[PDB]
């Protein structure tokens, strides 16, 4: 047996941030070295644990979150950061234990006329709690006048589209992000390293 | 289409090393050889070496022997070429070139046919200790036929790429050779002549890109009006 | 190392003429010679291969001849897009060597330049420097004189020139002359003028502007 990390990273299509994907890895053995060996990873940070020690550790469960954000928003996937992605899209807790991995996806997620399939939430009445998902599309009311399902003055559709083109700068190019959560509960260890 | 796409332009300090990429597409990568040729600014061409993209055999010129390394990666169908202990006379554009296939003679002789039918775009490598600097783009607003353009000022190293309306506007465009100023930094100007009638009818944007600094600008060239105040 | 000498090193001809370039080898190289066309900024382009065989797509007007050590490359009737630097390359014996090159240029009738002037943009003035740009569009011959007059006084040593390479459609040149001052020095003067003298102009032509207007 081997835990399907290839299914998570080498997936053909990725999710939008506001509807970020979550895969649960359970009851198998995980070769972490395949990950911390690739020169493809633009970003690779681990909180509460080192990759070095990962192949010799045992966990109750692991969570692989997947999404696509633009280039200079990747710094928002870290404990204590704020910004539209960290506030209204994907939020990491302060005591986060896990890893953030990200690579440049301009070659696939960008099209000649611009890729508008990838979306993100701009407006929200409240910040998101850690690991909270919100896929609603109720009109955001920013004024005293209710909108009643129709957007107009100070009434907006909540979700906004990334304009992903191969001609955009490094900061506006799409990056694919995978977040590895390590749950260390009081239970049997189901996910462990080979050694 | 046969397609040889090289990596971006790059700067290194003297004594370092550069690894230039060459990606092949549109044919069975392994059945051919790849050659690396070098051209310094204002000089002729210089052959460097040959790589077998199936076996991995390598053969170099004596000048580069020892300090050059040619790599192959069949999975991604891309060749690599690394030069080490760089110095100022290694400032040049590097091309990867494909010639056709070698054959066997009626006698049983191996004959080569090394004439480069396909070329890459070229990778500019500049070797100097000066530090990378991104450009600043300013508009040269127009005043029959009207002239407008963009000034791409103080930047290092070469090159910058300038398009107009993202490649939509092409005729009448003059992009000038960059000039070293006393600063040690380069500057350049990209101009275009259009009908005066179009100045109000069409909009003109210069797309400047300088990836050694990871810089990209889309500058709006607005016509200058003398009687527009508030 | 086989060394290929290419001649002439430079040459100018008119549209419709025959062009003949020679490449002589240091050793007998059979007919394993190739002829490339390289236009400025682009990669070389194979035109002739194995001394005489026209490579697919290349027009009928290109020609190759020779065997042994002397070779010739011929253009039937020159056309405006033929300007480039041409190279000869041998592969008889490693290492593969190229010739020195032959720069090919068009001889054209005299065309007067179109002169424009660009005062410094406000965006740049806010950064502390001022760049005045004079542009000479589509002229021939290449030699032109650009004089910067600042309140009728002549600046020296603060400008720089840039020339495009000859055009592939009308065989003309374009010239850039940029004078860059500090903003403090820039606003010491009022009149900026570009006086241009060229063979096509019956008299020197001046384009001027008043700073602040
Ligand atoms: C995801 O991407 C590719 C799928 O082919 C894998 O890349 C390689 O990993 C193997 C070892 O397993 C190496 O031999 C190759 O050189 C790697 N290729 C490149 C281009 O780096 C990768 O391992 C896959 N892994 C996951 C977890 O999806």
XYZ file of C-alpha atoms and ligand atoms in Angstrom:
666
model
C 0.000 0.000 0.000
C 0.962 3.637 -0.585
C -0.987 6.826 0.145
C -2.178 8.556 -3.090
C -0.146 11.767 -3.005
C 0.222 11.635 -6.785
C -3.553 11.918 -7.007
C -3.352 15.205 -5.093
C -0.383 16.933 -6.710
C -0.395 15.555 -10.262
C -4.133 16.096 -10.695
C -5.259 17.410 -14.072
C -7.672 20.046 -12.728
C -7.503 22.049 -9.506
C -10.182 23.842 -7.512
C -10.859 27.519 -7.026
C -9.902 28.981 -3.655
C -13.419 29.737 -2.418
C -14.291 26.092 -3.129
C -10.936 24.644 -2.083
C -10.582 20.871 -2.337
C -9.829 18.558 0.588
C -8.552 14.981 0.325
C -8.320 12.740 3.390
C -5.380 10.331 3.504
C -5.951 7.439 5.904
C -4.711 3.885 6.527
C -1.593 3.612 4.356
C 2.150 4.387 4.199
C 3.359 7.713 2.806
C 6.734 8.244 1.109
C 7.295 11.938 1.856
C 10.717 12.020 0.154
C 9.120 12.097 -3.317
C 7.843 15.506 -2.237
C 10.895 17.109 -0.588
C 13.083 16.122 -3.538
C 11.463 17.963 -6.469
C 13.031 21.086 -7.969
C 9.525 22.044 -9.209
C 8.338 23.446 -5.853
C 8.469 27.242 -5.799
C 7.325 27.302 -2.145
C 7.824 24.681 0.600
C 7.375 25.553 4.293
C 6.587 23.231 7.219
C 5.200 24.334 10.590
C 5.685 22.322 13.765
C 7.663 19.624 11.937
C 10.571 19.199 9.543
C 10.299 17.194 6.285
C 13.559 15.506 7.294
C 11.695 13.774 10.146
C 8.460 13.177 8.196
C 9.341 9.740 6.798
C 9.711 8.460 10.402
C 6.471 9.741 11.945
C 2.983 8.384 12.605
C -0.325 10.240 12.396
C -4.021 9.678 13.008
C -4.984 11.253 9.669
C -3.608 13.589 7.013
C -5.456 16.228 4.981
C -4.326 17.379 1.528
C -6.005 20.667 0.619
C -5.691 21.797 -2.994
C -6.411 25.056 -4.800
C -5.084 27.688 -7.226
C -4.281 31.291 -6.314
C -2.343 34.033 -8.014
C 1.361 34.526 -7.527
C 1.700 37.102 -4.748
C -1.147 35.651 -2.662
C 0.803 32.500 -1.723
C 2.362 34.412 1.177
C -1.149 34.525 2.690
C -1.249 30.734 3.279
C 0.600 30.957 6.591
C -0.459 31.241 10.252
C -1.477 34.762 11.210
C -1.595 36.281 7.720
C -4.447 38.463 6.494
C -5.632 39.338 3.017
C -8.557 38.384 0.797
C -7.359 34.784 0.401
C -6.523 34.361 4.086
C -9.667 36.193 5.231
C -12.426 35.168 2.803
C -11.103 32.023 1.109
C -8.595 29.744 2.871
C -7.567 30.230 6.503
C -4.847 28.426 8.463
C -4.909 28.281 12.280
C -2.238 29.812 14.481
C -1.197 26.427 15.930
C -1.017 24.929 12.424
C 1.089 21.768 12.104
C 1.768 20.806 8.511
C 3.227 21.984 5.230
C 2.483 24.476 2.452
C 3.746 23.567 -1.027
C 3.244 25.608 -4.180
C 4.437 25.711 -7.786
C 3.961 27.895 -10.863
C 1.122 26.735 -13.111
C 1.361 29.303 -15.903
C 1.996 26.574 -18.495
C -1.357 24.842 -17.863
C -3.717 27.171 -15.976
C -3.250 30.088 -18.414
C -4.904 30.430 -21.826
C -4.430 32.780 -24.770
C -7.616 34.749 -24.140
C -7.281 34.496 -20.374
C -8.481 31.734 -18.060
C -11.572 32.885 -16.147
C -12.479 29.475 -14.701
C -10.545 30.175 -11.484
C -12.423 32.275 -8.934
C -12.001 33.727 -5.452
C -14.148 35.521 -2.889
C -13.640 39.288 -2.543
C -16.476 40.312 -0.198
C -17.702 38.728 3.029
C -19.487 40.021 6.122
C -16.986 38.185 8.347
C -13.540 36.642 8.176
C -13.331 32.873 7.826
C -12.448 30.657 10.766
C -9.547 28.202 10.309
C -10.281 25.513 7.701
C -13.681 27.017 6.858
C -15.235 26.688 3.397
C -17.835 29.055 1.930
C -19.277 28.552 -1.561
C -22.328 30.817 -1.262
C -23.143 33.387 -3.931
C -25.645 35.606 -2.140
C -25.288 39.227 -3.215
C -22.976 41.108 -0.869
C -24.763 44.130 0.588
C -22.290 46.966 1.177
C -24.854 49.727 1.788
C -28.001 50.473 3.746
C -30.222 49.554 0.779
C -30.959 45.805 0.616
C -30.332 44.192 -2.756
C -33.022 41.468 -2.800
C -31.025 39.168 -5.072
C -30.158 41.841 -7.667
C -26.747 43.510 -7.627
C -26.434 47.231 -8.298
C -25.173 50.268 -6.396
C -23.334 48.968 -3.303
C -24.698 45.509 -4.159
C -22.182 43.065 -5.612
C -21.853 39.456 -6.629
C -19.430 38.057 -4.025
C -17.108 36.009 -6.252
C -14.501 37.448 -8.624
C -12.501 35.864 -11.443
C -8.742 35.638 -11.873
C -7.603 36.798 -15.291
C -4.928 34.187 -16.006
C -2.845 34.884 -19.118
C 0.630 33.635 -20.088
C 1.579 37.296 -20.600
C 1.017 38.317 -16.972
C 3.833 39.058 -14.576
C 5.193 36.497 -12.131
C 2.983 38.037 -9.422
C -0.262 37.562 -11.362
C 0.568 34.116 -12.717
C -1.404 31.168 -11.311
C 0.180 28.952 -8.669
C -1.105 25.557 -7.563
C -1.030 25.103 -3.783
C -1.232 21.959 -1.641
C -1.575 22.153 2.156
C -0.707 19.042 4.179
C -2.405 18.877 7.590
C -1.088 16.334 10.105
C -3.677 15.371 12.730
C -2.094 13.986 15.914
C -5.137 12.811 17.869
C -5.419 10.239 20.678
C -6.216 7.308 18.405
C -4.464 4.590 16.344
C -1.843 5.841 13.912
C -3.147 5.204 10.389
C -0.723 7.287 8.276
C 2.963 6.563 8.824
C 6.295 6.880 7.088
C 8.033 3.874 5.546
C 10.983 4.049 7.955
C 5.704 22.290 -36.333
C 9.234 21.651 -35.082
C 9.850 23.882 -32.073
C 13.060 24.570 -30.131
C 12.312 26.845 -27.162
C 15.152 28.118 -24.972
C 15.098 29.454 -21.423
C 15.104 33.100 -20.401
C 17.964 35.559 -20.533
C 20.222 35.438 -17.523
C 23.034 37.260 -15.721
C 25.849 35.794 -13.632
C 28.877 37.064 -11.802
C 32.327 36.146 -13.154
C 33.482 32.742 -11.968
C 29.966 31.270 -11.753
C 28.087 28.932 -14.115
C 24.948 28.984 -16.294
C 22.678 26.092 -17.288
C 20.718 26.913 -20.455
C 17.622 24.914 -21.390
C 16.503 23.756 -24.830
C 13.038 22.211 -25.203
C 12.236 20.210 -28.340
C 8.714 19.562 -29.600
C 7.065 18.375 -32.800
C 9.205 15.301 -33.563
C 10.591 12.174 -31.909
C 13.248 13.782 -29.678
C 15.611 10.806 -29.430
C 16.133 10.130 -33.145
C 18.215 13.314 -33.592
C 21.312 15.104 -32.332
C 21.524 18.571 -30.808
C 24.305 21.124 -31.212
C 25.148 24.225 -29.189
C 26.420 27.357 -30.939
C 27.530 30.629 -29.357
C 27.494 34.208 -30.678
C 29.038 37.147 -28.820
C 27.525 40.627 -29.391
C 28.808 41.836 -32.748
C 30.825 38.698 -33.562
C 30.290 35.584 -35.653
C 29.146 32.113 -34.678
C 31.084 29.505 -32.704
C 30.201 25.826 -32.423
C 30.507 24.334 -28.934
C 29.539 20.661 -28.930
C 27.121 17.897 -29.837
C 24.781 15.778 -27.704
C 23.118 12.465 -28.562
C 19.560 12.816 -27.271
C 19.069 9.031 -27.056
C 22.308 7.577 -25.698
C 23.720 10.707 -24.101
C 27.081 10.718 -25.878
C 28.857 14.066 -25.676
C 31.639 15.660 -27.713
C 32.987 19.180 -27.240
C 35.308 21.668 -28.854
C 38.738 21.971 -27.255
C 38.101 25.573 -26.163
C 35.185 24.577 -23.925
C 36.457 21.082 -23.024
C 36.400 20.536 -19.273
C 34.227 23.516 -18.331
C 31.187 22.648 -20.503
C 28.568 19.997 -19.722
C 25.734 18.836 -21.994
C 22.735 17.083 -20.428
C 19.663 15.337 -21.834
C 16.216 14.630 -20.365
C 14.062 12.385 -22.550
C 11.065 12.485 -20.189
C 10.529 16.190 -20.912
C 12.389 16.022 -24.266
C 14.766 18.831 -23.321
C 18.511 19.291 -23.702
C 20.713 21.251 -21.298
C 24.094 22.962 -21.610
C 26.094 24.307 -18.661
C 29.201 26.512 -18.795
C 31.326 26.914 -15.664
C 33.995 29.343 -14.462
C 32.232 32.045 -16.444
C 33.979 35.289 -17.366
C 33.399 38.379 -19.487
C 34.367 36.803 -22.815
C 31.522 34.289 -22.325
C 28.893 37.033 -22.812
C 26.856 35.744 -25.743
C 23.628 34.353 -27.151
C 23.477 30.553 -26.996
C 21.489 28.627 -29.602
C 20.513 24.974 -29.623
C 20.290 23.699 -33.191
C 18.965 20.499 -34.726
C 20.514 19.120 -37.901
C 18.962 16.160 -39.748
C 19.836 12.504 -39.289
C 23.120 10.819 -40.080
C 22.982 7.933 -42.535
C 25.043 4.948 -43.683
C 26.674 4.873 -47.106
C 26.427 2.271 -49.841
C 29.992 1.346 -48.857
C 28.983 1.049 -45.198
C 30.492 4.451 -44.273
C 28.978 6.608 -41.562
C 28.312 10.062 -43.011
C 27.089 13.097 -41.108
C 24.719 15.771 -42.399
C 25.392 18.533 -39.861
C 23.574 21.538 -41.289
C 21.260 23.172 -38.780
C 17.735 23.161 -40.164
C 16.122 24.114 -36.852
C 17.239 26.723 -34.336
C 16.174 27.984 -30.940
C 15.258 31.545 -30.077
C 18.607 32.141 -28.368
C 19.502 32.648 -24.704
C 21.403 35.812 -23.815
C 23.863 35.351 -20.949
C 25.639 38.421 -19.568
C 28.652 37.953 -17.288
C 29.403 40.893 -14.988
C 29.307 41.795 -11.304
C 26.751 44.588 -11.772
C 23.467 43.951 -9.982
C 20.148 43.389 -11.746
C 17.976 46.477 -12.173
C 14.472 46.657 -13.586
C 13.535 49.410 -16.018
C 11.241 52.391 -15.653
C 8.910 53.009 -18.595
C 7.835 56.545 -19.514
C 5.555 57.687 -22.358
C 6.646 59.743 -25.354
C 3.294 61.358 -26.173
C 2.488 62.452 -29.744
C 2.123 65.954 -31.132
C -0.701 64.218 -41.127
C 0.950 61.335 -39.291
C 1.724 61.288 -35.571
C 4.616 59.627 -33.743
C 4.365 58.150 -30.243
C 6.365 55.715 -28.168
C 7.827 54.593 -24.863
C 11.164 55.223 -23.145
C 12.568 52.223 -21.251
C 15.194 53.750 -18.971
C 18.003 52.581 -16.641
C 17.934 48.781 -16.558
C 20.378 45.878 -16.483
C 21.068 43.545 -18.055
C 19.801 43.184 -21.599
C 17.330 42.418 -23.028
C 13.921 44.035 -22.803
C 11.041 42.971 -25.035
C 8.651 45.680 -26.233
C 5.380 45.029 -28.053
C 2.457 47.301 -28.924
C -1.175 46.484 -28.097
C 0.218 43.057 -27.128
C 1.506 42.279 -30.607
C -1.568 43.681 -32.371
C 0.239 46.782 -33.684
C 3.299 45.978 -35.790
C 3.715 48.166 -38.885
C 5.550 51.445 -38.390
C 7.101 50.175 -35.148
C 10.789 50.971 -34.598
C 12.418 49.492 -31.494
C 15.909 50.965 -31.174
C 19.088 49.202 -30.037
C 19.751 49.760 -26.350
C 22.592 52.080 -25.350
C 24.878 51.930 -22.332
C 24.850 55.228 -20.465
C 27.565 56.542 -18.141
C 25.514 54.876 -15.399
C 26.457 51.411 -16.570
C 22.722 50.897 -17.121
C 20.956 50.505 -20.451
C 18.161 52.547 -21.988
C 15.978 52.120 -25.047
C 13.109 53.715 -26.947
C 10.268 52.053 -28.858
C 8.340 54.288 -31.259
C 5.531 53.899 -33.787
C 3.984 56.220 -36.371
C 0.204 56.100 -36.790
C -2.382 58.274 -38.584
C -3.243 61.434 -36.679
C -6.928 60.551 -37.122
C -6.392 57.397 -35.050
C -4.956 59.247 -32.027
C -8.463 59.734 -30.647
C -9.943 56.619 -32.242
C -7.406 54.014 -31.067
C -5.612 53.456 -27.765
C -1.886 52.707 -27.588
C -0.196 50.633 -24.875
C 3.436 49.528 -24.866
C 4.063 46.112 -23.298
C 7.571 46.125 -21.809
C 9.015 42.940 -20.314
C 12.417 42.508 -18.615
C 12.528 39.082 -16.903
C 16.118 39.186 -15.577
C 14.508 41.597 -13.097
C 11.052 39.949 -13.304
C 9.528 43.211 -14.528
C 6.504 43.739 -16.755
C 4.830 47.056 -17.567
C 1.816 47.929 -19.732
C 2.238 51.671 -20.222
C -0.582 53.866 -21.548
C 0.554 56.474 -24.085
C -1.993 59.310 -23.766
C -1.968 62.126 -26.339
C -0.754 65.389 -24.829
C -3.373 68.155 -24.883
C -2.435 71.768 -24.179
C -5.918 73.160 -23.416
C -7.183 70.559 -20.926
C -7.193 71.929 -17.376
C -9.166 71.699 -14.143
C 40.868 23.710 -37.072
C 39.610 24.543 -40.560
C 39.347 28.307 -41.084
C 36.928 29.754 -43.644
C 37.641 33.215 -45.057
C 34.591 35.103 -46.327
C 34.666 37.984 -48.791
C 33.721 40.710 -49.062
C 33.345 41.461 -45.348
C 30.829 44.189 -46.249
C 28.883 45.003 -49.399
C 26.103 47.301 -50.612
C 24.009 46.607 -53.715
C 20.770 47.835 -55.269
C 17.404 46.118 -55.605
C 17.474 43.715 -58.544
C 21.253 43.253 -58.712
C 23.174 39.991 -58.586
C 25.184 39.428 -55.405
C 28.191 37.093 -55.206
C 29.877 36.188 -51.901
C 32.876 33.865 -51.628
C 34.030 31.468 -48.910
C 37.490 29.895 -49.167
C 38.533 27.025 -46.901
C 41.897 26.346 -45.281
C 41.623 22.640 -46.196
C 39.765 20.528 -48.743
C 36.269 20.150 -47.297
C 34.591 18.245 -50.163
C 31.211 19.995 -50.668
C 30.255 19.933 -46.965
C 29.609 23.675 -46.821
C 26.458 25.475 -45.691
C 25.210 29.050 -46.109
C 23.167 30.843 -43.420
C 21.204 34.096 -43.410
C 21.021 35.958 -40.083
C 18.941 39.087 -39.771
C 19.507 41.317 -36.722
C 18.149 39.902 -33.475
C 17.082 36.607 -35.070
C 18.697 33.189 -35.148
C 20.582 32.070 -38.272
C 18.503 30.547 -41.064
C 19.765 27.778 -43.338
C 19.543 28.819 -46.992
C 22.053 26.616 -48.837
C 23.392 23.230 -47.776
C 26.020 20.845 -49.140
C 27.433 23.650 -51.311
C 24.559 23.950 -53.786
C 21.246 22.403 -52.634
C 18.452 24.900 -51.977
C 16.710 24.091 -48.696
C 12.918 23.848 -48.810
C 11.023 27.131 -48.634
C 13.993 29.287 -49.700
C 13.280 31.360 -52.845
C 14.596 30.420 -56.276
C 16.973 33.398 -56.391
C 19.501 31.922 -53.933
C 22.380 29.950 -55.441
C 25.325 27.889 -54.272
C 28.378 26.662 -56.129
C 31.801 25.214 -55.465
C 33.843 22.166 -54.494
C 37.121 21.586 -52.712
C 38.178 24.837 -51.032
C 36.631 27.763 -52.971
C 32.865 28.290 -52.764
C 30.433 30.938 -53.961
C 26.965 32.036 -52.844
C 24.821 34.011 -55.266
C 21.635 36.073 -55.092
C 19.921 36.172 -58.500
C 18.228 39.577 -58.231
C 18.477 41.203 -54.805
C 15.267 42.093 -52.959
C 14.694 44.458 -50.002
C 14.260 41.712 -47.385
C 17.594 40.097 -48.321
C 19.678 42.311 -46.020
C 21.359 40.208 -43.336
C 24.738 38.836 -42.336
C 25.489 35.654 -44.260
C 27.729 32.906 -42.910
C 29.470 29.868 -44.373
C 29.928 26.765 -42.219
C 31.932 23.585 -42.773
C 31.314 20.182 -41.204
C 33.837 18.078 -43.152
C 36.126 17.800 -40.118
C 35.367 18.600 -36.472
C 35.157 21.058 -35.001
C 32.458 22.728 -37.103
C 33.623 26.254 -37.935
C 31.850 29.229 -39.488
C 33.230 32.010 -41.636
C 33.633 35.611 -40.584
C 30.384 36.790 -42.148
C 29.273 39.145 -44.910
C 27.030 42.103 -44.071
C 24.632 42.820 -46.945
C 22.984 46.236 -47.320
C 20.684 47.913 -49.850
C 21.701 50.881 -51.968
C 18.665 53.146 -52.238
C 17.701 56.596 -53.426
C 18.102 59.505 -51.027
C 15.173 59.879 -48.620
C 14.796 62.777 -46.194
C 14.034 61.998 -42.532
C 10.803 62.824 -40.740
C 11.741 64.723 -37.573
C 9.755 64.667 -34.326
C 10.613 65.852 -30.816
C 9.349 64.601 -27.444
C 9.649 66.720 -24.285
C 10.130 64.925 -20.957
C 6.983 63.338 -19.578
C 5.594 64.598 -16.277
C 5.798 61.045 -14.909
C 9.567 61.123 -15.418
C 9.982 64.730 -14.262
C 8.606 63.598 -10.906
C 11.543 61.151 -10.628
C 14.136 63.946 -10.820
C 15.470 63.543 -14.378
C 14.368 64.855 -17.776
C 14.877 63.004 -21.069
C 14.251 64.869 -24.331
C 13.965 62.578 -27.360
C 14.498 63.492 -31.013
C 13.393 60.982 -33.639
C 14.335 60.815 -37.324
C 12.041 58.441 -39.195
C 12.826 56.500 -42.382
C 15.798 58.233 -44.003
C 18.621 57.248 -46.348
C 21.615 57.544 -46.517
C 22.483 56.500 -42.968
C 24.688 59.505 -42.177
C 22.762 62.277 -40.410
C 23.787 65.103 -38.077
C 21.685 65.808 -34.973
C 22.468 68.955 -32.973
C 20.813 69.727 -29.639
C 20.254 73.457 -29.126
C 19.267 74.604 -25.636
C 18.289 78.289 -25.663
C 20.321 78.459 -28.907
C 23.376 77.080 -27.078
C 24.748 73.682 -28.071
C 24.895 70.881 -25.516
C 27.813 68.456 -25.697
C 28.287 65.126 -23.961
C 24.825 64.618 -22.430
C 23.031 62.948 -25.363
C 23.317 59.594 -27.092
C 22.349 58.257 -30.518
C 20.808 54.945 -31.583
C 20.256 53.735 -35.149
C 17.956 50.964 -36.300
C 19.274 48.530 -38.841
C 18.075 48.894 -42.418
C 14.401 48.171 -43.024
C 13.291 45.092 -44.951
C 10.502 46.881 -46.857
C 11.682 50.406 -47.745
C 15.423 49.975 -46.989
C 15.564 53.015 -44.695
C 17.104 53.912 -41.344
C 15.704 55.487 -38.187
C 17.621 57.495 -35.603
C 17.145 58.137 -31.885
C 18.918 60.977 -30.089
C 18.194 61.330 -26.381
C 19.460 64.190 -24.209
C 19.061 63.527 -20.480
C 19.502 66.287 -17.897
C 18.756 66.579 -14.223
C 15.417 68.241 -13.521
C 17.243 71.131 -11.836
C 19.426 71.668 -14.907
C 16.425 70.968 -17.148
C 14.349 73.850 -15.784
C 17.242 76.315 -16.085
C 16.429 76.681 -19.798
C 13.321 77.420 -21.848
C 13.845 76.399 -25.505
C 14.814 72.889 -26.615
C 15.534 72.360 -30.302
C 16.659 69.502 -32.547
C 18.470 70.705 -35.670
C 18.938 67.943 -38.236
C 21.176 68.038 -41.304
C 20.897 65.270 -43.896
C 21.657 64.909 -47.597
C 17.952 64.707 -48.462
C 17.197 68.028 -46.744
C 17.866 71.160 -48.792
C 18.445 73.014 -45.502
C 18.828 71.960 -41.849
C 15.409 71.306 -40.299
C 14.717 72.313 -36.690
C 12.020 71.001 -34.335
C 11.688 72.960 -31.101
C 9.536 73.318 -28.001
C 9.188 75.706 -25.064
C 9.525 74.121 -21.628
C 6.339 74.381 -19.574
C 3.950 74.719 -22.526
C 4.123 13.871 -9.896
O 4.797 14.259 -11.166
C 5.674 13.341 -11.851
C 4.813 12.354 -12.610
O 5.545 11.740 -13.662
C 6.700 12.681 -10.926
O 7.981 13.220 -11.230
C 9.064 12.405 -11.012
O 9.371 11.544 -9.915
C 10.187 10.417 -10.271
C 10.355 9.590 -9.017
O 9.117 9.044 -8.583
C 11.517 10.894 -10.853
O 12.265 9.768 -11.295
C 11.279 11.851 -12.014
O 12.515 12.396 -12.461
C 10.349 12.980 -11.585
N 10.073 13.871 -12.700
C 10.202 15.200 -12.619
C 9.875 15.969 -13.863
O 10.569 15.755 -11.588
C 6.381 12.936 -9.462
O 7.111 12.044 -8.627
C 4.900 12.745 -9.213
N 4.648 12.660 -7.778
C 3.490 12.915 -7.150
C 3.508 12.736 -5.661
O 2.480 13.276 -7.743
